[PDB]
């Protein structure tokens, strides 16, 4: 909804043309020799391979950069957002969930276009913390500055650039002063969250991560903790999930962790991803779901 707003629209452009668009950084695509080595030793961590994963996608219209989190994924988890929110007023039974007015959700909806424009590789904020202590096992205990943590640190730079540089569109329309507009900067270091405009952002980064969570890994580590927060709905967070699926298939993208699974489709995924109006046409042109 406040995708299509003067605001929405300079925020989208913004997160393109200053970060998304470009390709991630080399010199963060694996750890060093000594990293590796003791990082292998854990057999129970992901492989640190996956610093270098999803690294560039070919397609028809170009190659795109940072496939995994790029400006299909940005605007996807923007979009869930508000229908996120109609799921969770309607089935948490939980009251707190009424503080989100159109004002609330419109701000979480707005601090998803800036949820990834730090990164500078794939890797997860699981794989940082076994770098960080894979750097300690390999190196006498020295300290190393968690990667993933750096790269929040780096968008919420670009976030307040932009919203100083757009201040009296922004406030207090958007957010009442700078005090609030500190509070929000800060909801940007996402490492339990207990605010509901949290909880809302929270679980969009969780839906998405069906394009690249295998299947008993999305459903235990995301649907689980779904399901209860819509008070044990399984069906209403089917219909959910399945929303989150739709807008995957809407833009090309791969969908490995729940419902009808696909690769990429790499002729949408290349015109969705190199075009951010483009990208959004096509999400809006999935229904919305019913609540009851």
Not at 34 to 50: C, F, G, I, M, P
Not at 155 to 184: M, R
Request: proline share 4%; charged share 20%; glycine share 6%.
């Amino acid at each position: 909804d406040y995708l299509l707003s003067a605001n929405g629209s300079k925020a989208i452009d913004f997160v393109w043309s200053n970060f998304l668009k470009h390709p991630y950084n080399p010199k963060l695509k694996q750890p060093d020799a000594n990293v590796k080595a003791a990082w292998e030793k854990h057999a129970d961590w992901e492989h640190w391979s996956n610093m270098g994963q999803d690294w560039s996608l070919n397609t028809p219209s170009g190659l795109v950069p940072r496939p995994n989190h790029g400006i299909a994924h940005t605007l996807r988890v923007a979009q869930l957002v508000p229908v996120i929110a109609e799921f969770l007023k309607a089935y948490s039974g939980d009251p707190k969930f009424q503080k989100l007015t159109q004002k609330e959700i419109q701000k979480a909806q707005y601090m998803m276009l800036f949820s990834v424009i730090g990164r500078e590789n794939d890797m997860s904020w699981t794989d940082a913390n076994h770098y960080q202590q894979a750097f300690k096992e390999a190196y006498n205990g020295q300290y190393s500055k968690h990667i993933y943590a750096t790269f929040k640190e780096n968008a919420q730079k670009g976030f307040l650039n932009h919203v100083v540089t757009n201040k009296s569109s922004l406030i207090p329309s958007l957010f009442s002063d700078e005090s609030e507009l500190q509070y929000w900067a800060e909801a940007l270091d996402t490492g339990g969250i207990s605010s509901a405009s949290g909880i809302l952002m929270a679980l969009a980064h969780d839906l998405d991560l069906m394009r690249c969570y295998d299947k008993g890994k999305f459903n235990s580590l995301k649907m689980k903790d779904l399901v209860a927060r819509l008070g044990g709905n399984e069906d209403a967070a089917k219909k959910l999930a399945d929303y989150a699926h739709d807008l995957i298939v809407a833009t090309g993208d791969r969908c490995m962790g729940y419902g009808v699974t696909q690769d990429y489709n790499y002729s949408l995924f290349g015109k969705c991803s190199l075009d951010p109006n483009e990208c959004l046409k096509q999400l809006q042109s999935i229904p919305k779901p019913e609540t009851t």
